[PDB]
């Protein structure tokens, strides 16, 4: 039971970390676009 | 070795100087005394010029003797290409320096994504040089690489990158535990001493200062070049006040582009 639950936890954390990195790259692009907007 | 090249060119100019100074002695003596209004003044001028010329001959002979004490020991197409290659290389170095000092580019506009393998290759290339710095990459949180740069028995720098571009740095002392309880890097800490908090501040200005827009290899290489100069902490005195200690601080400021020690109060 312990080993199965540890594997599920590790899968969830790998998914979250990769999500954070991709969202961070998108946030960088959006920050550049929004702050450099002329308006 | 290059020192023999410089000593030989030096002594070439020494012989030319000796020959011309001897000929200058005899040429000024050929003309004879000039007029120069006051009689006392003309005697003074002639004596002074003759004495100066003789002294210059003696100095040139002495310099030639000193270089003697210090001296050590189809085919034309290849040498012509060699000479022209060195000429083009030096010409291009000077012209590139003059032009990138004064660029006229105002904006990038007209009218980050990297494999982590590339980051490891770049940082291992930097770690191969500077034999007193060891860089140990690890990735505890995703693709953002975290670096421990140890530096002599002096520093431990924790550099937190983001896509092969330095983001944050924390400088701690040698003994200081940079690891947490679980043996991961302590990315968020301070260093219990005044000196290393000052060097964290100077390192953040260093990563704000060395900013090329596109190419990041020059940035990390130049940051490590600047960081390497901190090995003479606690040994270098300040180049403004001479002393080692201002308010109990060593000179924590290694100046960019001329790595000299200063207390930050001495700017
Ligand atoms: Zn000072």
From Swiss-Prot, chain A:
Domain of life of the organism encoding this protein: Eukaryota
Stretches of the chain forming a coiled coil according to its record: 1-22
Subcellular compartments: Nucleus
Described function: Component of the Mediator complex, a coactivator involved in the regulated transcription of nearly all RNA polymerase II-dependent genes. Mediator functions as a bridge to convey information from gene-specific regulatory proteins to the basal RNA polymerase II transcription machinery. Mediator is recruited to promoters by direct interactions with regulatory proteins and serves as a scaffold for the assembly of a functional preinitiation complex with RNA polymerase II and the general transcription factors.
Protein family according to the UniProt entry: Belongs to the Mediator complex subunit 22 family.
Subunit relationships: Component of the Mediator complex, which is composed of MED1, MED4, MED6, MED7, MED8, MED9, MED10, MED11, MED12, MED13, MED13L, MED14, MED15, MED16, MED17, MED18, MED19, MED20, MED21, MED22, MED23, MED24, MED25, MED26, MED27, MED29, MED30, MED31, CCNC, CDK8 and CDC2L6/CDK11. The MED12, MED13, CCNC and CDK8 subunits form a distinct module termed the CDK8 module. Mediator containing the CDK8 module is less active than Mediator lacking this module in supporting transcriptional activation.
Protein name: Mediator of RNA polymerase II transcription subunit 22
Lineage, broadest ranks: Eukaryota, Metazoa, Chordata, Craniata, Vertebrata
Gene: MED22
Swiss-Prot record, chain B:
N6-methyllysine PTM positions: 105
Function: Component of the Mediator complex, a coactivator involved in the regulated transcription of nearly all RNA polymerase II-dependent genes. Mediator functions as a bridge to convey information from gene-specific regulatory proteins to the basal RNA polymerase II transcription machinery. Mediator is recruited to promoters by direct interactions with regulatory proteins and serves as a scaffold for the assembly of a functional preinitiation complex with RNA polymerase II and the general transcription factors.
Substitution effect: residue 57 to G: In NEDSCAC; uncertain significance
Family listed: Belongs to the Mediator complex subunit 27 family.
GO biological process: positive regulation of transcription elongation by RNA polymerase II; positive regulation of transcription initiation by RNA polymerase II; protein ubiquitination; regulation of transcription by RNA polymerase II; RNA polymerase II preinitiation complex assembly; somatic stem cell population maintenance; transcription initiation at RNA polymerase II promoter
Record's GO cellular component terms: core mediator complex; cytosol; mediator complex; nucleolus; nucleoplasm; nucleus; transcription regulator complex; ubiquitin ligase complex
Protein name: Mediator of RNA polymerase II transcription subunit 27
Subcellular location: Nucleus
Origin species: Homo sapiens (Human)
Subunit organization: Component of the Mediator complex, which is composed of MED1, MED4, MED6, MED7, MED8, MED9, MED10, MED11, MED12, MED13, MED13L, MED14, MED15, MED16, MED17, MED18, MED19, MED20, MED21, MED22, MED23, MED24, MED25, MED26, MED27, MED29, MED30, MED31, CCNC, CDK8 and CDC2L6/CDK11. The MED12, MED13, CCNC and CDK8 subunits form a distinct module termed the CDK8 module. Mediator containing the CDK8 module is less active than Mediator lacking this module in supporting transcriptional activation.
């Amino acid at each position: 039971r312990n080993q199965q639950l540890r594997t599920l936890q590790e899968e969830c954390d790998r998914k979250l970390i990769t999500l954070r990195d991709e969202i961070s790259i998108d946030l960088y692009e959006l920050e550049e676009e929004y702050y450099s907007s002329s308006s | 070795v290059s020192v023999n090249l410089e000593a030989f060119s030096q002594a070439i100019s020494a012989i030319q100087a000796l020959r011309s100074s001897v000929s200058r002695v005899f040429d000024c003596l050929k003309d004879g005394m000039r007029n120069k209004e006051t009689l006392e003044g003309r005697e003074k001028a002639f004596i002074a010029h003759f004495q100066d010329n003789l002294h210059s001959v003696n100095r040139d002979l002495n310099e030639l003797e000193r270089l003697s004490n210090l001296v050590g020991k189809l085919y034309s197409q290849l040498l012509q290409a060699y000479k022209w290659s060195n000429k083009l290389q030096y010409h291009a170095g000077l012209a590139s320096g003059l032009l990138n000092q004064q660029s006229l580019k105002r904006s990038a506009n007209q009218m980050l994504v990297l494999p982590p393998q590339y980051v490891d290759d770049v940082i291992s290339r930097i770690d191969r040089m500077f034999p007193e710095m060891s860089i140990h990459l690890s990735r505890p949180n995703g693709t953002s690489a975290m670096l421990l740069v140890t530096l002599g028995k002096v520093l431990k720098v924790i550099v937190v990158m983001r896509s092969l571009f330095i983001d944050r740095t924390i400088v701690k002392g040698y003994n200081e535990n940079v690891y947490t309880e679980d043996g991961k890097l302590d990315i968020w800490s301070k260093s219990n001493y005044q000196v290393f908090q000052k060097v964290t501040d100077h390192a953040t200005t260093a990563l704000l200062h060395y900013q090329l827009p596109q190419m990041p290899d020059v940035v990390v290489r130049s940051f490590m070049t600047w960081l390497r100069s901190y090995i003479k902490l606690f040994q270098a005195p300040c180049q403004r006040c001479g002393k080692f200690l201002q308010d109990g601080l060593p000179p924590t400021w290694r100046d960019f582009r001329t790595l000299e020690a200063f207390h930050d109060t001495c700017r």
